[PDB]
């Protein structure tokens, strides 16, 4: 495929182009050495025995004239196999940061992990252990056909006529064996997917007294699939064993007619041997390499997943936002539409957030709220419409301008293994220690530093002291506060068991001296009561827009949401006085 000539490293296209023809003549030299077995053994005893090793001196010419060309192909392939080993994983590594994060599915992240980890020595001996043994063994049955032409043409074209029928026969045996492993992996998956389902629902089944009714239904469904498997073994391998039989039927076949339908050629018992050395390495390696052919073809395809389908964000670096740098910008959505595949997430949204204020986005978990922040931050781009920061399209921004424009507090802390101070300095590594101290204090990370013997130098990875969810969040808030971006986004997912984490979010929104346009997807009244504007997002559309006091006076969707969140904080088990029968409130 074009999989390998994608992995061809620069400065080495001449070493692979020479390799292409330098390994091609080796197949030509082993083809003349095979047809040189025709006369050498025909004179060794058949007629006029012992001829003083004439053709042996000419076969010793082509044997070690192949030794010279093959002592470089492996050596060249060894360095060529390491050159692709180096260029491949480096290119995929430098390409992943510039991938639209919509691409990072749970599965595409698993294939990307395989491509950049489990592809070490397999790519090292890629060419020498499979590419050169396959390129050679695929053209040898046709190489002797042109190397036998000068001995006999009715015997020569009969090889090129018989080389196309046996390749297709194996191509059908390899297709029957490939179509048989598919159904094999499907039934066993259907076998085990019922075992997994009965295991994950064991609590619900036992609590509902449905454990035995489901025990028999799965036991019989597995007993029926067990029967369907037995009948498909009877009518399948009557063909597989036939094709290695088909390998030895052509051997004794031609050797069984060249013995009786000839009579005029008892020097043609090298012909039974010449036909053998043509079929010695035909389906002997082809079956021995067909197990490692897709085992090396799809690691070139999961590798093809990263680079061929980069899905790199457009990011045309046309602008740098060098207007009012460091000033809180306005945020504008102009007919912004977004879809994850085929489902609509944002269905034409238009609003304009005035610069300097803070907006709270609420809504029934439609995942559009979080999408609104991703489009502002630049993690994703709108399918149609524009997102403008002070009238400048976020997609028209330079990579360094879009990176330094938005600061984000994700739902997850996203902390790396290292010192606690290093996880905060990610927001600004060259920031003065006064700014780092203020960020960790406003985020209330200093409350955590007291219980740490090493302070902010305490390593928080797996080899160090562990942090709780609320503490990890406060570290993430300090990281976002430390970055001097004129925009701050909070995808609120704060711990309900940490009053310091709840107070750190409020402080980060209301006690930050830096002018920032702030947007927060929040659920607590303590975090949204300070907002100047509320966007109620429902079914991919902004169905309410206004200030807190005026939305509460309208008595609509946000008014009910506010009253429910208020009652949720005052909630206590067994405190409604059995008044649930009348109002259901």
């Amino acid at each position, epitope marked *: 495929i074009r999989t390998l000539l994608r992995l061809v490293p620069a400065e080495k296209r001449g070493a692979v182009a020479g390799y292409a023809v330098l390994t091609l003549l080796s197949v030509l030299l082993r083809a003349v050495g095979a047809v040189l077995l025709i006369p050498l053994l025909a004179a060794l005893f058949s007629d006029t025995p012992s001829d003083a090793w004439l053709w042996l001196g000419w076969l010793t010419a082509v044997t070690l004239a192949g030794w010279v060309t093959d002592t470089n192909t492996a050596r060249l392939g060894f360095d060529l196999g390491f050159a692709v080993l180096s260029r491949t994983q480096h290119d995929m590594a430098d390409r992943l940061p510039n991938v639209a994060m919509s691409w990072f599915t749970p599965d595409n992240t698993a294939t990307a992990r395989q491509a950049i980890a489990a592809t070490g020595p397999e790519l090292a001996g890629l060419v020498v252990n499979l590419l050169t043994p396959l390129i050679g063994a695929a053209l040898l049955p046709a190489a002797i056909g042109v190397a036998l032409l000068f001995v006999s043409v009715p015997l020569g074209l009969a090889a090129l006529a018989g080389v196309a029928v046996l390749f297709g026969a194996l191509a059908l045996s390899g297709r029957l064996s490939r179509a048989a492993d598919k159904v094999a992996g499907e039934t066993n998956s259907a076998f085990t997917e019922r075992i997994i389902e009965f295991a994950r629902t064991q609590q619900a089944l036992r609590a509902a007294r449905r454990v035995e009714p489901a025990r028999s239904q799965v036991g019989s469904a597995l007993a029926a699939q067990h029967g369907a498997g037995l009948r498909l073994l009877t009518m399948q391998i009557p063909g597989q064993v036939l094709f290695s039989l088909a390998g030895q039927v052509a051997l004794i076949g031609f050797a069984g007619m060249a013995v009786w339908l000839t009579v005029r050629g008892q020097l043609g018992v090298p012909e039974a041997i010449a036909l053998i050395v043509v079929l010695v390495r035909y389906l002997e390696p082809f079956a021995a390499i067909a197990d490692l052919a897709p085992a090396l073809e799809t690691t070139r395809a999961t590798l093809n997943r990263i680079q061929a389908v980069l899905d790199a964000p457009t990011l045309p670096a046309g602008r740098r936002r060098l207007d009012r740098t460091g000033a809180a910008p306005s945020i504008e959505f102009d007919d912004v539409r977004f879809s994850y595949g085929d489902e609509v997430v944002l269905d034409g949204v238009s609003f304009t957030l005035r610069p300097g*204020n803070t907006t709270a986005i609420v809504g029934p978990s439609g995942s559009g709220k979080t999408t609104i922040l991703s489009l502002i931050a630049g993690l994703q781009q709108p399918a149609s419409g524009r997102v403008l920061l002070d009238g400048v399209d976020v997609t028209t921004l330079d990579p360094e301008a879009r990176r330094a424009a938005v600061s984000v507090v994700f739902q997850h802390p996203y902390l790396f293994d290292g010192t606690l101070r290093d996880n905060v300095l990610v927001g600004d590594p060259e920031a003065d220690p006064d700014d780092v101290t*203020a960020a960790m204090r406003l985020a209330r990370v200093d409350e955590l530093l007291d219980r740490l013997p090493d302070g902010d130098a305490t390593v928080v990875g797996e080899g160090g002291t562990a942090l709780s969810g609320g503490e990890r969040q406060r570290v993430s808030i300090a990281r976002a506060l430390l970055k001097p971006a004129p925009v701050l986004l909070v995808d609120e997912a704060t711990s309900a068991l940490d009053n310091a984490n709840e107070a750190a979010v409020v402080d980060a929104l209301t*006690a930050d001296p*830096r002018p920032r346009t702030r947007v927060i997807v929040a659920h607590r009244l303590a975090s949204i009561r*300070h907002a100047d504007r509320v966007l109620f997002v429902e079914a991919g559309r902004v169905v309410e827009d206004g*200030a*807190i006091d005026e939305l509460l006076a309208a008595g609509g969707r946000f008014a009910q949401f506010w009253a429910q969140q208020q009652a949720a904080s005052e909630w206590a088990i067994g405190s409604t006085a059995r008044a649930l029968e009348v109002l259901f409130q």
Partner: nanobody
Amino acid sequence: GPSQVQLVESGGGLVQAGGSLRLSCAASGFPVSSSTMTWYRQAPGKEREWVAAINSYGYYTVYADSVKGRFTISRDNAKNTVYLQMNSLKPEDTAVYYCNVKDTGQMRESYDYWGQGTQVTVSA
């Protein structure tokens, strides 16, 4: 009314380059320790830009990159005023300086309070 916000600026005037000035903002109607106080400046014909701001708690200070290291903001709760000592005054700092406080917290649309500003002219 009796709790009416009022901000007045002072300390401006003409001073040649390399000099220093100290601005003051006498606030009224609200505690300066409750909200965040910000210093703005606006040259004639151009849009206003923030210069520095101080936290409500009093420890978090931020400065614009064009004044950081030369300008310093501080607060005196006892007199309820805000200070801005600007050293190494470059002619780019010639503008009308204002102090700002915003009425947030109250579940309404935030309203900005401004003063009449003080003129700061610096010649080279």
